[PDB]
Amino acid sequence: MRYIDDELENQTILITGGAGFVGSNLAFHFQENHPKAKVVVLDKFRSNPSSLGHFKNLIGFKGEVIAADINNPLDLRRLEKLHFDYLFHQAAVSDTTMLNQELVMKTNYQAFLNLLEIARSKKAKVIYASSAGVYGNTKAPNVVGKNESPENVYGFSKLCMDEFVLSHSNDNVQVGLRYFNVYGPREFYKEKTASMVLQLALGAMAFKEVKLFEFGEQLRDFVYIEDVIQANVKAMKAQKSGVYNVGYSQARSYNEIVSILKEHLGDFKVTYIKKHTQAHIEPTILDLDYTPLYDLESGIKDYLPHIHAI
Amino acid sequence: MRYIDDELENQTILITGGAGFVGSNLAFHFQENHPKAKVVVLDKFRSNPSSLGHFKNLIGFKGEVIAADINNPLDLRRLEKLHFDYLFHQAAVSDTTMLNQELVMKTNYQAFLNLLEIARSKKAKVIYASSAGVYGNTKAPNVVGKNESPENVYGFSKLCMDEFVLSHSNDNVQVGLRYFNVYGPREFYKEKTASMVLQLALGAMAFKEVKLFEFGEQLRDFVYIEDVIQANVKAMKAQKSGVYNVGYSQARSYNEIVSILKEHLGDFKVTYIKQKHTQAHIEPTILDLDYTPLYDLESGIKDYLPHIHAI
Amino acid sequence: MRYIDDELENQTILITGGAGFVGSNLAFHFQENHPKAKVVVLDKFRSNPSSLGHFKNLIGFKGEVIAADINNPLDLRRLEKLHFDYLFHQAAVSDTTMLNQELVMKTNYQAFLNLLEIARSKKAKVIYASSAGVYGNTKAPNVVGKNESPENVYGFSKLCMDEFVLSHSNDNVQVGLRYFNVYGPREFYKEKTASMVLQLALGAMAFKEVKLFEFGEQLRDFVYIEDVIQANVKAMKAQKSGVYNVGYSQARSYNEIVSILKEHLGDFKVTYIKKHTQAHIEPTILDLDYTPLYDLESGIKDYLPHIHAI
Amino acid sequence: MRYIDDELENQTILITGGAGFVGSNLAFHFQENHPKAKVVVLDKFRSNPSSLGHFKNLIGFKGEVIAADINNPLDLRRLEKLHFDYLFHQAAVSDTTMLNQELVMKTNYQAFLNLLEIARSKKAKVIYASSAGVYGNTKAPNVVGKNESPENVYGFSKLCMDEFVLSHSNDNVQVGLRYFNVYGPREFYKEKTASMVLQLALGAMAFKEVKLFEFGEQLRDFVYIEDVIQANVKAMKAQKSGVYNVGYSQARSYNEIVSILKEHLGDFKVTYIKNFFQKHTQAHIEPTILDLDYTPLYDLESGIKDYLPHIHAI
Amino acid sequence: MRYIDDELENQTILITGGAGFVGSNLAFHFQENHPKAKVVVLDKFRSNPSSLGHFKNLIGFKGEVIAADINNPLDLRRLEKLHFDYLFHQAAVSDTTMLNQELVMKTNYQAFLNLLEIARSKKAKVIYASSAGVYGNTKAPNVVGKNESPENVYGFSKLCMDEFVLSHSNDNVQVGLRYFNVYGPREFYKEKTASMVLQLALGAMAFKEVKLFEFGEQLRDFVYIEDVIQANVKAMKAQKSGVYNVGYSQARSYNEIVSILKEHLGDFKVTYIKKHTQAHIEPTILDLDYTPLYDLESGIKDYLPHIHAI
Ligand SMILES: NC(=O)c1ccc[n+]([C@@H]2O[C@H](COP(=O)([O-])OP(=O)(O)OC[C@H]3O[C@@H](n4cnc5c(N)ncnc54)[C@H](O)[C@@H]3O)[C@@H](O)[C@H]2O)c1
Ligand SMILES: NC(=O)c1ccc[n+]([C@@H]2O[C@H](COP(=O)([O-])OP(=O)(O)OC[C@H]3O[C@@H](n4cnc5c(N)ncnc54)[C@H](O)[C@@H]3O)[C@@H](O)[C@H]2O)c1
Ligand SMILES: NC(=O)c1ccc[n+]([C@@H]2O[C@H](COP(=O)([O-])OP(=O)(O)OC[C@H]3O[C@@H](n4cnc5c(N)ncnc54)[C@H](O)[C@@H]3O)[C@@H](O)[C@H]2O)c1
Ligand SMILES: NC(=O)c1ccc[n+]([C@@H]2O[C@H](COP(=O)([O-])OP(=O)(O)OC[C@H]3O[C@@H](n4cnc5c(N)ncnc54)[C@H](O)[C@@H]3O)[C@@H](O)[C@H]2O)c1
Ligand SMILES: NC(=O)c1ccc[n+]([C@@H]2O[C@H](COP(=O)([O-])OP(=O)(O)OC[C@H]3O[C@@H](n4cnc5c(N)ncnc54)[C@H](O)[C@@H]3O)[C@@H](O)[C@H]2O)c1
């Protein structure tokens, strides 16, 4: 479903982290909705921890690929040969093994700045993925510009990306997107770091039993992969730089998932064991015409068929 | 046997992966059939897993060699000094130890793109080896453009090669060749990844007994190394880019091998042990490259068998 | 609190080791006190030993970051793209794991010389951190120019920094600052190498018991992080190169800390187990208008609230 | 003993693998016989397998050395600063640990091509060491151009060197020399890969007993290090590229060594051992004589005789 | 004590291996005797085997340092930025762990040639350290040009240095100095490879007992560090290239040390356990005006006070 009535006729779209969850979904959206645009996906491609990209997420991709590591000078230098009109920077490190603090900064921030430089020279608009992690454990709703107190390097690295584009808001049109607990197709290969809806839904379908921490009633703003996609494409029409929250702007408990899940998968065991996010989405709507569809229900509904692929 | 009535008189032919199975066979074909052409073979040469090229496969080669690693910038930069008219890209990674996903892509795809760039600048026609692996476990017959759902990185990497040349069909004349279970001389050093005909034929000749999975009646389109060669040389007359299936277009069971094998090696034990089906849709290849495979599993096993006797 | 009535309006301030103790504190001072100045922090960012920088020390930073390793030619080359007016070189190696002698010299001295070269070309004033370690075990008070007999590589490396700027006092305005046992907020992540006031105060607050070597009456010139900050900002108005001692110029025993500590945290155990520094601060005062506030008391007082964050 | 009546007065001679057996002997020959020529020896210098070069082989060398690895771009780039008139490429890998196939090709062939390129640009004549290994187990006599079927990478790599210069016979004057079982002074440090005459003569002198495979009557064309030297110096007057066999052109059994050896060292034990397993080499030397004026002296006898005094250095 | 009545007023002196024994002593000589000259010391600085340089040997150095590895292209390339008038090449590998043959050649010879190239371009006179090791076990006296049959790589590498400068005697003024068993202050950190006078004198002062091989009456030409220094400074006035022996030209047995030692430290045990060098110094005297003072006696005498620093 087109999110902008632009043909993107002779445009070249570069998606880094294209073998990953959002990157691959995004690449497919353009493939199906703007068949005239050139979609080129770039990715390191699963190093095994570290990069959890996977060719399985690109199974029906008819565009082109670039096997590259954004930290590799040679690869970046070669990337300058490519003429692209847009850059959707989705490539980053898996929080799973985010051990070393210096390395998370290298690939999540340092590498980013370099892509910014290349995009600016090519006067290609930039749309990048930030994170709701920039807020750390602060009071919800989470508003951009307020209480961004990361609790881990990964969250901090993302904050640095934003603090940078904000400081350089006129170097080029650069739009940061802070995602909040995204779920949907193609997140399976993120392994243990795949969404809880994917986690729960799978435990239910498998062991017919599902584990969940202390009452699992903690609230997270779950945004469906489709709305995240809408955000990226809407963002490419931005005539000014900025960083926006991108969630459904409605928090839901892990229990409500289990619930909406039972309402589909029937009943299952709810074994326990012994933070609050909600996207303030106003400016996003205001600036990007963003308008999320898919609440946890519409989301879990649309996603569930794929989850059945067992 | 000439597959094109061209002399290839002052042409320089570059064959990457020339120390490997098809590359070495190909190099010899040109050597014997187009003696006027300059055949230059390039290869990393067996690193031990990884590259399974082997000088034994070039024992009677009178042309020239280039010891190089296609992933090595210095080697590639040095390769630009060479003026070649054709590039047969056969160099790739052994599915045997295809462990790391990032590395398969580096050498099978990234390295490929760079060769593409060099060939284009030198305006040298490109003929490269793809794989039937791009189809994964989909319904046979396998048609280019349909149901290409790789199941492993190796298959995917090959698909990326094709998806690229198709997107750049006018940058230069680039012809991809999707091989299906190739067998024939010089595949011995591929070790455990050598064709089943070579595997079975050897077990029979040795232990007089042969193992084989669940009834071994699964069908594979076995194409003899000679037809693969025909495909490459026919492909060098292509005036347009494209990717083609290259098999015999006739599936055969592992049992039919055992059969055609007993019909030669006499009888032997058929021990078993406890979901794919390939068959090349070859129409476009015929149509575009004048490809016409000879050698059915019988003619193939027949012609191959004498060499297999070298024990 | 402004330490100079300069607006620093369109100035760019580069702080290396900005993710560390003094660097992060310094970056915040400029942020809060000279909001018009551009504060750019650079750091390797904790490699795990080695670099003990930590994003936690930059939690409220609104300026920009540079993920870089001063020993990396590529990073340094990229750094030349940045136009900065001042360089506060705080980046150095953690004495904790200062094992290899060659490596301490590389990052503490060799890397320093290169920054000197870059700053000189950019005609940017240089203010760097030296150490009271240059004096080794010599008679106190410790006077710059006298009895600088390092006892370890780290101390020596710092000495080389000074012996160099002194030899090149006219290449650019380069000011070295020899710190003496600094304490205060944001030194927690220095782990085992964090100040004794932080060490003792934590043992007291936790185990209600505190260990301390042979009578712990050995004297150290403890200087509060705030005075160190005063020193750096005062130093940026220097019109001539030089190296200065920066302490409170008043030695205090580890017992006096325990004392001033009990006077706050109540009583606690003083278990034992079986060098003398005092900054000669005259020239510093004379040349930089340096005037330390915060004695061990005012220091421990102001610091203690933060230490309570447990 | 001069092998050419040329003074080589202001010539610079570059010998790669100069810390090795033939390279070091060669460097000494020029030192003693053409004292006006500049002899510069280049070598990696024993990495420990791999490179078995050793400073002991250059003990009386008054010329100059270049510590370099021919596979190292930086070293090769620095080598271009040197102006040399001749290049004697003796540097190669020890068959002893020739494990990895890719690596033998890198240093024995790839590295060679680059030296060829540098020599060509400097218009310096090239004389390189090939091997009788290019023939593998084929019928003797071994003739250049016929039955070159290597059995190992090392032999293949050498063949590639030749197939290349032959394809590029006019790029510069490049002369390949296929050595057959060379023996003589300065091969001791090749360890286990030192000639059988050195091996046997040492076992005899030590344990007074000598081991030897299946009857040890298999024939090898043993060429004395001195004739190899004659070949290189004669080769530097070649006005055309080419690859030549360089042996004595007369095969001898390992027993004849033991024999010529007893005739000197007195008697000793001759213990055998068993474990198709056949090879037979004999250099067809005609073209070499024809083109290089090569004329080998030293039969196994004259060879073992002249060599034996040095072997006594125990 | 000045060894040349030249002021060396605006000269820049580069000493490699400056953190080592002779290099550090040399650097101090110029510091004290030619205060007008710029003394810059370069060293890798103890990697732990390998490089046994140590900052302790530069404790009172007021000149400048360069942390560099002569085998590192980047460091050598950076070194070209420095304008120096003289190069005293003292840096080399410790015979102690001289295991790999290829590596000794790399740093002792290959790295040397590169320094030769840089010095030649800068038209800076070169004075380098060779060794009496070039003679191996040949008949004494040891004459330059005769019987140089090294027995180890280290000795050979040194020989190559000389055979090179001799072949290139007109490329620049390059003077090689073949030292013979040098002893004196600042050799302590050479550990087990420190002079026998230092070894014996320490065993005597400590365990009051001293070990010594087969009768310890083997003769070595022991030259005091001060005469070695005289040789280097006299060498910098050479107007022609050449390689010279630099010893006292008088062999002495290890027993004579024990003797001259007892004559000072009183008596001690002489426990045993089960080559001959003598520098032919004529050409050195003739060409460099070299005239050694300090026989084993004057040497042991002058050195002994320092050895007392225990
Ligand atoms: N819950 C969420 O999914 C969520 C929340 C907040 C922010 N984000 C951000 O959205 C973006 C995409 O996340 P995702 O869900 O797709 O994760 P993902 O791991 O599925 O996709 C990211 C891709 O980056 C690739 N990559 C990693 N290192 C690379 C390198 N050095 N060079 C090239 N490619 C490299 C990985 O292989 C992977 O394919 C990120 O920037 C991520 O931090 C996601
Ligand atoms: N059954 C088959 O034979 C079959 C089936 C499908 C596809 N293919 C394709 O055919 C082509 C060749 O197959 P093959 O049977 O010759 O396999 P092979 O193992 O012989 O590979 C050919 C050569 O590639 C060389 N090589 C690998 N990496 C290299 C590198 N980085 N640099 C230089 N050389 C390198 C190896 O040394 C080997 O000599 C490939 O593109 C392969 O994917 C073959
Ligand atoms: N804290 C004291 O009392 C004291 C005493 C004497 C001297 N000093 C000196 O003051 C300066 C700052 O000390 P600190 O208390 O901030 O120590 P710190 O270790 O907390 O901070 C130093 C920062 O430098 C960073 N760094 C290290 N190597 C780097 C590299 N290669 N590239 C980029 N960044 C790198 C570290 O990660 C850290 O963030 C140093 O030069 C230190 O030696 C401090
Ligand atoms: N019987 C024989 O001795 C025989 C027979 C046939 C061919 N050959 C050939 O003769 C030539 C010399 O043989 P050799 O007897 O001197 O053996 P050798 O062991 O002495 O090897 C010669 C030298 O090559 C040097 N070298 C190896 N790799 C190097 C590198 N990367 N860079 C620089 N130097 C390197 C070795 O260190 C050694 O000094 C070769 O080309 C060899 O293959 C010898
Ligand atoms: N001291 C003696 O008895 C004696 C005798 C004969 C020759 N020599 C020669 O005199 C010179 C100095 O000897 P020394 O007694 O001072 O030994 P030393 O080890 O004290 O001095 C050598 C210096 O070279 C430095 N160095 C080593 N490798 C380096 C590298 N890669 N880059 C930069 N610096 C490096 C070491 O750190 C050390 O500081 C040498 O050339 C040595 O071989 C000394």
| Catalytic residue from among C3, C154, C224, C248 | C154
8 A C-beta contact, residue B27 and residue B15 = yes
**Which residue minimizes the CA distance to atom 10 of ligand 5?**
E129
A48 and A36 Cβ atoms separated by less than 8 Å: no
Rounded to whole angstroms, the Cα distance separating D90 from D129 reads: 5
Rg over alpha carbons for chain D, rounded to the nearest Å, is 19
d(CA A239, CA A174): 9
As a whole number of angstroms, the distance between CA B169 and CA E192 comes to 70
Q: Which of D38, D93, D84, D91 is nearest to D68 (CA)?
A: D91
Choose the closest CB to C47 out of A73, A102, A160: A102
C positions 110-129 inside 8 Å of A (CB): none
The answer to whether B100 contacts A44, with C-beta atoms less than 8 Å apart, is no
Q: Determine whether the interchain pair B163/A65 forms a contact, defined as Cβ–Cβ distance below 8 Å.
A: yes
Helix, coil or strand: residue D86:
strand
> What is the whole-number distance in angstroms between the Cα of residue C196 and the centre of ligand 3?
17
Domains of chain C: 11-179+225-246+275-291 (3.40.50.720), 180-224+247-274+292-310 (3.90.25.10)
- E strand intervals along chain E: 12-16, 38-43, 64-67, 86-89, 125-131, 174-179, 182-183, 209-211, 219-220, 223-224, 242-246, 252-253, 269-271
Token digits of residue A51: 């990069």
Q: Are B40 and B63 contacting, i.e. CB atoms less than 8 angstroms apart?
A: yes
- Ligand 5 midpoint to CA E115 (Å): 15
Return d(Cα A133, Cα A182) in angstroms, integer: 12
Q: Which of B83, B118, B87 is nearest to B15 (CA)?
A: B87
Could you give the C-alpha distances from E28 to E1, E234, E235, in angstroms and in order?
11, 16, 17
What residues does E1 pair with on adjacent strands? none
Q: Is the CB of C69 under 6 A from ligand 3?
A: yes
| Partners of residue B69 in chain D, C-beta under 8 Å | 102
The answer to whether B20 touches B90, Cβ cutoff 8 Å, is: yes
Other beta carbons within 10 Å of C286 = 10
Residue A134's Cα: distance from chain center in Å?
14
In Å, how far is E219's CA from the nearest CA of chain C?
36
After which residues are there C–N gaps above 2.5 Å in chain C?
48, 274
CB distance C177 to C236 below 8 Å: no
Integer Cα distance of A86 and A236 in angstroms: 8
Q: Which amino acid is at B12?
A: T
B67 touches chain D (CB under 8 A): yes
Q: Which of E47, E64, E74 sits opposite C102 (nearest CB)?
A: E47
Nearest to C131 by CA among C157, C102, C170: C157
Cα(A92) to centroid(ligand 1), Å: 4
DSSP strand pairing (C219-220 vs C252-253): antiparallel
Count other C-beta atoms under 10 Å from residue E207's C-beta. Answer: 12
Closest CA to C179 of C165, C191, C167, C161: C161
Say whether B163 and A47 touch across the interface (CB within 8 A). Answer: no
How far is CA C110 from its chain centroid? 19
Q: What is the residue whose two structure tokens read 């290609």? A: A124
Whole-angstrom distance, CA of residue C2 vs CA of residue B310: 90
CB contact under 8 A, C47 and A101: yes
Contact D65, E163 (CB under 8 A): yes
Give CA separation, B136 vs A45, B147, D158, E264, in Å. Answer: 19, 8, 43, 89
Going from the Cα of E90 to the center of ligand 5, the distance in angstroms, rounded, reads 5
Q: Do the beta carbons of residue C160 and residue C273 sit within 8 Å?
A: no
Q: Are B209 and B188 in contact (CB under 8 A)?
A: no
| Nearest-angstrom CA–CA distance, C251 and A165 | 47
Q: Does D65 touch chain E (CB under 8 A)?
A: yes
Q: Is D47 on the interface with E (CB under 8 A)?
A: yes
Say if residues E114 and E73 touch (Cβ distance below 8 Å): no
Strand partners, B242: B175
In angstroms, what is the C-alpha Rg of chain C? 19
Given a contact cutoff of 8 angstroms between Cβ atoms, the answer to whether A58 and A15 are in contact is no
Consecutive H or E run containing B212 = none
Breaks (C-N over 2.5 A) in chain B follow: 48, 274
Nearest CA to ligand 4 atom 18: D20
Strand order in the sheet with B125-131: B64-67, B38-43, B12-16, B86-89, B125-131, B174-179, B242-246
How far CA B104 is from CA of B95, B96, B150, B158, C28, in Å, comes to 9, 12, 14, 10, 47
- Per DSSP, the three-state class of C195 is coil
Total count of residues recorded for chain A: 310
HEC assignment per residue over C272-304: CCCCCCCECCHHHHHHHCCCCCCCHHHHHHHHH
Angle at E29 (CA atoms; ends E24, E32), nearest 5 degrees: 120
E51 touches chain C (CB under 8 A): yes
- What DSSP assignment string belongs to C16-76? ETTTSHHHHHHHHHHHHH-TTSEEEEEE-----------GGGGTT--SEEEE--TT-HHHH
Q: Closest Cα partner for C220 from C186, C249, C178?
A: C249
Element of type H or E holding C220: strand C219-220
Catalytic positions of B: 154, 190
**Assigned token pair, B148:** 């290409």
C60 interfaces chain A, CB cutoff of 8 Å: yes
Q: Determine whether the shortest distance from the Cβ of B245 to ligand 2 is under 6 A.
A: no
- Angle, alpha carbons D242-D244-D246 (nearest 5°): 155
In chain E, DSSP finds a helix count (H) and a strand count (E) of 10, 13
User: Do you find a cis peptide bond into E141, omega within 30 degrees of 0?
Assistant: yes
Distance, in angstroms, between E172 CA and closest chain D CA? 17
Where are the alpha helices (H) located in C100-140, listed in sequence order? 101-105, 111-121
Q: What are phi and psi of B159, to 5 degrees?
A: -65, -40
Ligand nearest to the CA of E245: 5
Q: How far is CA E259 from CA A96, C150, E172, E188, in A?
A: 71, 37, 45, 21
Q: Starting from the edge strand earliest in sequence, which strands make up the sheet with D64-67, in order?
A: D64-67, D38-43, D12-16, D86-89, D125-131, D174-179, D242-246
Which one from E154, E224, E244, E254 is the annotated catalytic residue? Answer: E154
- E contact test, residue of D42, D64, D79, D83 with most E CBs within 10 A: D64
C60: chain A residues, CB-CB within 8 Å: 149
Nearest chain C residue (CA) to E69: C102
Across C203-239, b (16+ Cβ under 10 Å) vs e yields bbbeeeebebeeebeebbbbbbbbbbbbbbbbbbebe
Whether residue C135 contacts residue C145, with contact meaning beta carbons closer than 8 Å, is answered with no
Q: Which runs of E-coded beta strand occur in D97-225?
A: 125-131, 174-179, 182-183, 209-211, 219-220, 223-224
Distance CA E102, CA D98 (A): 19
The identity of residue E150, as a single letter, is P
Query: Both tokens of residue A305?
Result: 């068929």
Is the beta carbon of C277 within 6 A of some atom in ligand 3? no
Instruction: Evaluate whether C196 touches C275 at the Cβ level (below 8 Å).
Output: no
C-beta atoms of E156 and D44 within 8 A = no
CA angle C32, C38, C42 (to 5 degrees): 100
Per DSSP, the three-state class of D243 is: strand
Q: List pocket residues of ligand 1, CB cut-off 6 Å.
A: A 16-17, 19-23, 43-44, 46, 51-53, 69-71, 90-94, 107, 129, 131-132, 179, 181-182, 190
Ligand in closest contact with the CA of A50: 1
| Chains D and A, touching by 3 or more CB pairs within 8 angstroms | no
Output the six-digit token pair for D59.
Answer: 């003990």
For C273, the token pair is 């187990």
| Gap from CA of D168 to ligand 2 centroid (Å) | 28
Question: How far lies A21's CA from each of A158, D66, E115, in Å?
Answer: 17, 55, 54
Task: Select the residue from A45, A59, A77 to test the B interface by mutation, using most B Cβ atoms within 10 A.
Answer: A45
B170 CB burial (10 A radius; 0-12, 13-18, 19+): exposed
Nearest C-alpha neighbor of B86 from the set B37, B60, B144, B125? B125
**Nearest chain C Cα distance for residue A216, angstroms:** 27
Q: Which of B182, B224, B245 to mutate to test the pocket of ligand 2 (most atoms within 8 A of CB)?
A: B182
Distance from residue B190's CA to the centre of ligand 2 (Å): 9
If phi > 0 it is left, if psi is from -120 to 50 it is alpha, else beta; for residue C66 that is beta
Phi-psi domain of C75 (left: phi exceeds 0; alpha: psi -120 through 50; beta: other): alpha
A195 CA to chain B: closest CA distance, Å?
23
| C-beta of residue B271 within 8 angstroms of C-beta of residue B207 | no
Of E180, E179, E165, E172, which Cα lies nearest the Cα of E242?
Answer: E165
Sole residue written with tokens 């299906």: B180
Q: According to the 3-state scheme, what is the secondary structure of chain A? A: CCCCCCCCCCCEEEEECCCCHHHHHHHHHHHHHCCCCEEEEEECCCCCCCCCCCHHHHCCCCCEEEECCCCCHHHHHHHCCCCCCEEEECCCCCHHHCCCHHHHHHHHHHHHHHHHHHHHHCCCEEEEEEEHHHHCCCCCCECCCCCCCCCCHHHHHHHHHHHHHHHCCCCCCEEEEEECCEECCCCHHHHHHCCHHHHHHHHHHCCCEECCCHHHCCEECCEEHHHHHHHHHHHCCCCCCEEEEECCCCCEEHHHHHHHHHHHHCCCEECCCCCCCCECCHHHHHHHCCCCCCCHHHHHHHHHHHHCCC
Does C36 participate in catalysis according to the annotation? Answer: no
Q: Which numbered ligand comes closest to the C-alpha of D90?
A: 4
3-state helix, strand, coil in chain E (%, to 5): 40, 15, 40
* Tokens found for residue B289: 């490259």
Cβ-based neighbours of B202, under 8 Å, separated by 6 or more: B308
Residue B292: CB atoms within 10 Å: 13
In contact, B43 and B53? CB cutoff 8 Å: yes
Q: Which of A190, A244, A254, A290 is catalytic?
A: A190
Resolution (Å units): 2.5
Determine the length of chain E: 310
Q: Which among C292, C289, C264, C262 has a CA at the least distance from the CA of C278?
A: C292
Residue A103 to residue A94: CA distance in whole angstroms: 12
Inter-chain CB proximity A163 and C63 less than 8 Å: yes
Residue C57, number of CB atoms within 10 A of its CB: 27
Residue B107 near chain D (CB below 8 Å): no
**Token digits for D301?**
């006898």
CA distances from B308 to A58, B250, B269, E56 (A): 41, 23, 19, 72
In chain D, residues with a C-beta closer than 8 Å to the C-beta of E165 are: none
Ligand 3 pocket test target in C156, C179, C181, C248 with most atoms within 8 Å of CB: C179
Q: Could you tell me which of E294, E187, E169 has the C-alpha nearest to residue E230?
A: E294
Q: Are residues D74 and D38 in contact, defined by beta-carbon separation less than 8 angstroms?
A: no
User: Tokens 């770091």, residue?
Assistant: A193
First to last CA, chain C: 27
* Amino acid at the residue E291: T
Any known ligand binding at B308?
no
